[PDB]
């Protein structure tokens, strides 16, 4: 039995940006955005500021955001987890930061392997994560309900959120 059999994001575990294991069942009952981040992309500022906006405006309704740094796209996240943590803190991030991972290939974190094969997580244009700042919207049961590509600014997700609260 492996990740292909998982039924929910809530089954998974991941190290937070401080190295501590997190059981993602903490997100049971919470609409969640899962995104891969990087600090040195042209759209880093727009993505972080809009994710912060979304969290500020919707956390009280149950929105949670899980940010996974990854260095797989143009080496745009070269820093240590501590450096990334400090970078995010500079944007007043109050959502959840995770330790750096891979999102594609055989060493990808299993949550990312799983999200990519879900009916609403498969890409319109293929499943692989194409660049930094792909976003998955996850319902309160941990089911993937929509995928938004790197070119879709986080505020576009706002249109869909109330459907899942």
């Amino acid at each position: 039995d492996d990740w292909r059999a998982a039924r929910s994001m809530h089954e998974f575990s991941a190290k937070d940006i401080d190295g501590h294991m997190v059981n993602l069942d903490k997100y049971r009952g919470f609409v969640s955005i899962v995104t891969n981040v990087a600090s040195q992309c042209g759209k880093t500022e727009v993505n972080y500021t809009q994710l912060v906006d979304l969290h500020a405006r919707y956390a009280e309704r149950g929105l949670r955001i899980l940010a996974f740094p990854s260095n797989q796209f143009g080496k745009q996240e070269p820093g240590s987890n501590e450096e990334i943590k400090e970078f995010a803190a500079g944007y007043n991030v109050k959502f959840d930061m995770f330790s750096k991972i891979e999102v594609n290939g055989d060493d990808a974190h299993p949550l990312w392997k799983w999200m990519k094969i879900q009916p609403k997580g498969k890409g319109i244009l293929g499943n692989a994560i194409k660049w930094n700042f792909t976003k998955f919207l996850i319902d309160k049961n941990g089911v993937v309900v929509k995928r938004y590509g790197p070119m879709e600014e986080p505020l576009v997700i706002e249109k869909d959120l109330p459907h899942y609260f």
């Binding site: 039995d1 492996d2 059999a5 089954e11 575990s13 991941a14 294991m21 299993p110």
Partner: peptide, 13 residues
């Protein structure tokens, strides 16, 4: 059911 960091899954017995 839980999936560990390495991708293995275990459920209630």
């Amino acid at each position: 059911c839980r999936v560990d960091l390495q991708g293995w899954r275990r459920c209630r017995r």
